Amino acid sequence: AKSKNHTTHNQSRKWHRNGIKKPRSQRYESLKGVDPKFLRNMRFAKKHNKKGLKKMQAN
Amino acid sequence: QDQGEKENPMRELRIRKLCLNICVGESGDRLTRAAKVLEQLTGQTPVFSKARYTVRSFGIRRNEKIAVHCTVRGAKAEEILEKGLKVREYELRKNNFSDTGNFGFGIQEHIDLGIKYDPSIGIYGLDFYVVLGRPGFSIADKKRRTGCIGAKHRISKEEAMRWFQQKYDGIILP
Amino acid sequence: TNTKGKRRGTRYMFSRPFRKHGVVPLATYMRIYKKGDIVDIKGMGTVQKGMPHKCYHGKTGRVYNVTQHAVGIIVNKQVKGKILAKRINVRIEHIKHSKSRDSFLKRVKENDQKKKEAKEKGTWVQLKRQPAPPREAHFVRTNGKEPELLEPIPYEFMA
Amino acid sequence: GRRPARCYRYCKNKPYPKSRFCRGVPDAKIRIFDLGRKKAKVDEFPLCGHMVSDEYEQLSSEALEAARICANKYMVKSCGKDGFHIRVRLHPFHVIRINKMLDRLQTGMRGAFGKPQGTVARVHIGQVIMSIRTKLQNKEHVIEALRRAKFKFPGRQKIHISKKWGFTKFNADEFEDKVAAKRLIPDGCGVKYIPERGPLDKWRALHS
Amino acid sequence: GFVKVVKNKAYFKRYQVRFRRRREGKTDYYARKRLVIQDKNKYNTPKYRMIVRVTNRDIICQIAYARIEGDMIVCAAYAHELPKYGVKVGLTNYAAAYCTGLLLARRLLNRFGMDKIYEGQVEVNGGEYNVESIDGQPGAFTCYLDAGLARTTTGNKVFGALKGAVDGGLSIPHSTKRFPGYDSESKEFNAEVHRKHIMGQNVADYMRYLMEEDEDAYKKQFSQYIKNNVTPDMMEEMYKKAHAAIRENPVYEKKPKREVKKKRWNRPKMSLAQKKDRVAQKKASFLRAQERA
RNA sequence: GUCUACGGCCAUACCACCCUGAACGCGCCCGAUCUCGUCUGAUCUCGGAAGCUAAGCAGGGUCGGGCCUGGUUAGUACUUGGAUGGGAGACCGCCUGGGAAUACCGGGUGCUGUAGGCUU
RNA sequence: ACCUGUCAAACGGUAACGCAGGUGUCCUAAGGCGAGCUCAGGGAGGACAGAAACCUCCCGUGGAGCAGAAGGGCAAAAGCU
RNA sequence: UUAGAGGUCUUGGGGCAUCUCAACCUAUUCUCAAACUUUAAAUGGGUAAGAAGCCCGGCUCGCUGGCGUGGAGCCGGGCG
């Protein structure tokens, strides 16, 4: 009839068998969630980087 | 003395305001008579006061207009207080003076003060209270850089009597 | 079981310190947080908007987004045997700069300048930190004064 | 009507005082804690004796009442009714519970949280239970009175004659010198301690 | 001993003092937070405000932005330098408030190099004016009014300095309301009444009213006006001339610092030796006096 | 040596009472035509400049209360780890590391940023 | 199916027909903004007035209020008008 | 939540000009809290300890803006 309710016994042993792996780090991360108005400008900044290529090459 | 003469300008007693109050437990046309009484006496339109709580034994309800009151300042307050002290024939008790330098009394007949009885008006009396002060007492009421008036600049229960006896030639009895 | 309420058990962690209630000091709003810097999360109960969840109180992460009043933070959270990088939006009042990063950036500066000084002076200087070494040999002078003789005291039953 | 004291002895629960969460608590058996000549001054009862607990247990209010009565009865007979002052230094604040005394009711361990039954006092090792102050010549009677009150308590107690003056916190060897030097001003059963850390007007009043 | 003492030891133990400038009654921190705090995505961008403080004898106009260790004043103009421009009397009235704001605006634009680009509005009218930025040129300086604890009502002298600054060339957001020419019952703004206040005509009308009614009262209310020979007829020209003087030369010449002998006008703190000695001789005197008697 | 406007940290700054305050300022102060608001020009708003440092404000003082900081309490209380330690138990001792808090006793009683004055 | 304090062993999580309680609503304002005020309580005074009517001064770190239970938060506030 | 002590306005009482109690206040004192706290551990939890770094030069932006502003992005170079 009655049984056990809850336990965290043996749970920490299960976790460490394959390790508590920290999340992977990448040099470039997602732009997901950052300010949409800020995204719109950064795309415009990247779009027009082609202009001034002559000045960049001379310098 | 030299100190008294130099202290005369700023360390001088004067009447800050005169507070006249008529409390009647009713409302409606009953207290409208009292408002006209203060209107004729002071020349100012009084303001009504409502009951804070409901008390059944006094027959008053919360937020029901009960009393009328008015504040008079200036030479007008000086002359109205003179009339009230005349009725009391310049006689006060020691217990009439508070520890903060103020005092007050009561007049039972408004008619005998300044005016004539009218059939439509009532028989109400009224309450006088005098708020004494010195020049720099407004710093506690100002908004910007407010402060307390200091310890020696306050008025005590003794110098309040002295001003009453020196100005109005009054008598204090125990 | 207990409730799943958001502020259950935050009676003390979101309370203001003793005799430190009232107006929030204004320099907390004047701190400037750029993208990439490390911040400590510490919820303040005086401001109920943008409040971090209790599981992020005492946690440290880095700023990935800056808004008008808040900051997005990438914070590590342990969940039943896996650590995941959560993204949370916290108003400025509940965060402050982390001094551990500032100390390391200073050490990088003194290291680079010590390299430049060493190269210009033709010398070699130690740049790696080292653990506390064993104490070196030394002499201890008695100054003609004998060491004081200590002895255990007798037992006394007090009140 | 009451369970044997061995059922409630070992301080196995957290403190459970009378409060808005615990209502219906019967009144403790002990309501008087100071007995004898309470109005005596410091200078007339210099000797103090303590019954010190030697266990970590809880003592019932009935036990405290019984011990106080029997200690008082002996010291009245031996030292007179106005030759001592007894103070019980334990107040029953912990509430002990009892489960129901056993158709229309749910029996068993279901819903087994108890109702208040009585009050006990949690005592630590080395903590004073009772104190008696008297004249220096009644030392043997103080020891005897506290010895007889031991038998009313479950655990082990030790009888100790204090190094302080009466019920005060000051040593008996320095007490008279401090009073003469005005560092200790008697007031009631106890004394007041005067430092040099106030307005000089108080110092003027003391030395005037 | 009759009543329980409220300000007891425990009262002071858990008392929390207010901010220093709250308990001096100078700063309302509710408004300061909403006024000096910059948006976090506007990193390091200064947020400028115009402080207008009217004292009993002077008007202070400052332009400031907030920093962690304190505000920087980028420019300040006081009303007591108006005698250098012509205004000798009435240095705390609405007309002087307009001049102090105008001086603050011209002084700041001169420092930034924008004096010639942004000329504001030289021909003074009470009507609404706002500076619009010129393309290809540096933009207009934007500031926000800080009224402090002043009660913002129609005709408040803080809006007199605001009008002088916006007429000088500063971009300060505002409404034509709260200027003296605004009418509450009609919800309309009359620029002529505002222009009269800027030239002090409401003061000249009072002077003329007093000369006709009571000469003695006129001298009492205007003594320094008579000592400085400021007639009611020449008030408009005096303020007009002052406006031109401010616009022609707004630069401030600092008063030269003078080396002086350092003389203490205050008592220095007593040392531990003095404090302990004083108790020693006060105790000895009490013992000696009680022994003599 | 100081003040004013705006502040930062928010008592070493607060609270009670006493003494002193040159010069600028800050005020108290005088008044209600205009702007504005009131039962009341008390407050708020406006126009001033006869008087006064009495008050606010500043500096100092008090075997001052509070606050800050340090000793003491005390290697005490508590505690990580250990034992086929002790004890009928309650609990206690030791090894290995960490380590507090009242009462009690001393010292201190704002520092400072930007701009503008006085101390000529 | 939900919420508050505690249990719970100072991150988070943690059970029992464990303990103490609340919910199936209420609000055109009790939503939003601005301005202006300061609350509970107490002391001393004032015609009828008294332990409690209303008027005045003083003290008041919040000891009041913020609709629902509890905890947190809040004073030229988030409280009152 | 225990006990004495020192003062007194007492819409207090009792024995009788009153005087003691009670009440209140003040300075002390005994004993306490899982749903109390100014203070406050030990053992805990998070982050960091570089080349994805540091330092120079330039370009882009419709975002921000007194400004040669700020922020972000991009292109070169140097430093193990």
UniProtKB/Swiss-Prot annotation, chain A:
The modification Phosphoserine is found at residue 30. Signal peptide: none annotated. Residues 1-25 have a biased composition (Basic residues). Its main location: cytoplasm. The modification N6-methyllysine is found at residue 4. GO terms for cellular component: cytoplasm; cytosol; cytosolic large ribosomal subunit; cytosolic ribosome; membrane; postsynapse; presynapse; ribosome. Component of the large ribosomal subunit. Residues 1-33 are annotated as: Disordered. The gene is Rpl29. It is found in: Cytoplasm. This is Large ribosomal subunit protein eL29. Belongs to the eukaryotic ribosomal protein eL29 family. Keywords: Acetylation, Cytoplasm, Methylation, Phosphoprotein, Repeat, Ribonucleoprotein, Ribosomal protein. The modification N6-acetyllysine is found at residue 32. It comes from Mus musculus (Mouse). Transmembrane segments: none annotated. GO terms for molecular function: heparin binding; structural constituent of ribosome. It comes from the Eukaryota. Component of the large ribosomal subunit. The ribosome is a large ribonucleoprotein complex responsible for the synthesis of proteins in the cell. The chain holds residues 2 to 60 of 160 of the full protein. GO terms for biological process: cell-substrate adhesion; cytoplasmic translation; fibroblast proliferation; multicellular organism growth; translation; translation at postsynapse; translation at presynapse.
Swiss-Prot record, chain B:
The keyword Secreted does not apply. The modification Phosphothreonine is found at residues 42, 45. Keywords: Acetylation, Cytoplasm, Isopeptide bond, Nucleus, Phosphoprotein, Ribonucleoprotein, Ribosomal protein, RNA-binding, rRNA-binding, Ubl conjugation. Its main location: nucleus. The keyword Transmembrane does not apply. One of its GO terms (biological process) is protein targeting. It is found in: Nucleus, Nucleolus; Cytoplasm. There is a cross-link at residues 36, 50, 152 (Glycyl lysine isopeptide (Lys-Gly) (interchain with G-Cter in SUMO2)). GO terms for molecular function: 5S rRNA binding; structural constituent of ribosome; ubiquitin ligase inhibitor activity; ubiquitin protein ligase binding. Component of the large ribosomal subunit (LSU). Part of the 5S RNP complex, which is a LSU subcomplex composed of the 5S RNA, RPL5 and RPL11. Component of a hexameric 5S RNP precursor complex, composed of 5S RNA, RRS1, RPF2/BXDC1, RPL5, RPL11 and HEATR3; this complex acts as a precursor for ribosome assembly. Interacts with PML. Interacts with MDM2 (via its RanBP2-type zinc finger domain); negatively regulates MDM2-mediated TP53 ubiquitination and degradation. Interacts with NOP53; retains RPL11 into the nucleolus. This is Large ribosomal subunit protein uL5. It comes from Mus musculus (Mouse). The gene is Rpl11.
Swiss-Prot record, chain C:
Residues 111-122, 135-144 have a biased composition (Basic and acidic residues). InterPro entries: Ribosomal_eL21, Ribosomal_eL21_CS, Ribosomal_eL21_sf, Translation_prot_SH3-like_sf. Residues 111-144 are annotated as: Disordered. SUPFAM superfamilies: Translation proteins SH3-like domain (SSF50104). One of its GO terms (molecular function) is structural constituent of ribosome. The keyword Endoplasmic reticulum applies. The keyword Iron-sulfur does not apply. It is found in: Cytoplasm, Cytosol; Cytoplasm; Endoplasmic reticulum. GO terms for biological process: cytoplasmic translation. GO terms for cellular component: cytoplasm; cytosol; cytosolic large ribosomal subunit; endoplasmic reticulum; postsynapse; ribosome; synapse. Keywords: Cytoplasm, Endoplasmic reticulum, Ribonucleoprotein, Ribosomal protein. Component of the large ribosomal subunit. Component of the large ribosomal subunit. The ribosome is a large ribonucleoprotein complex responsible for the synthesis of proteins in the cell. Belongs to the eukaryotic ribosomal protein eL21 family. This is Large ribosomal subunit protein eL21.
UniProtKB/Swiss-Prot annotation, chain E:
One of its GO terms (biological process) is translation at presynapse. The modification Phosphothreonine is found at residue 231. Keywords: Acetylation, Cytoplasm, Isopeptide bond, Nucleus, Phosphoprotein, Ribonucleoprotein, Ribosomal protein, RNA-binding, rRNA-binding, Ubl conjugation. SUPFAM superfamilies: Translational machinery components. There is a cross-link at residue 219 (Glycyl lysine isopeptide (Lys-Gly) (interchain with G-Cter in SUMO1)). The modification N6-acetyllysine is found at residues 4, 47, 219. The modification N-acetylglycine is found at residue 1. Its main location: cytoplasm. Residues 257-267 have a biased composition (Basic residues). InterPro entries: Rbsml_uL18_euk, Ribosomal_uL18_C_euk. The keyword Transcription regulation does not apply. GO terms for cellular component: cytoplasm; cytosol; cytosolic large ribosomal subunit; nucleolus; postsynapse; presynapse; ribonucleoprotein complex; ribosome. It is found in: Cytoplasm; Nucleus, Nucleolus. Coiled coil: none annotated. One of its GO terms (molecular function) is structural constituent of ribosome. HAMAP family: Ribosomal_uL18_A (MF_01337_A). Belongs to the universal ribosomal protein uL18 family. Component of the ribosome, a large ribonucleoprotein complex responsible for the synthesis of proteins in the cell. The small ribosomal subunit (SSU) binds messenger RNAs (mRNAs) and translates the encoded message by selecting cognate aminoacyl-transfer RNA (tRNA) molecules. The large subunit (LSU) contains the ribosomal catalytic site termed the peptidyl transferase center (PTC), which catalyzes the formation of peptide bonds, thereby polymerizing the amino acids delivered by tRNAs into a polypeptide chain. This is Large ribosomal subunit protein uL18. It comes from Mus musculus (Mouse). The gene is Rpl5.
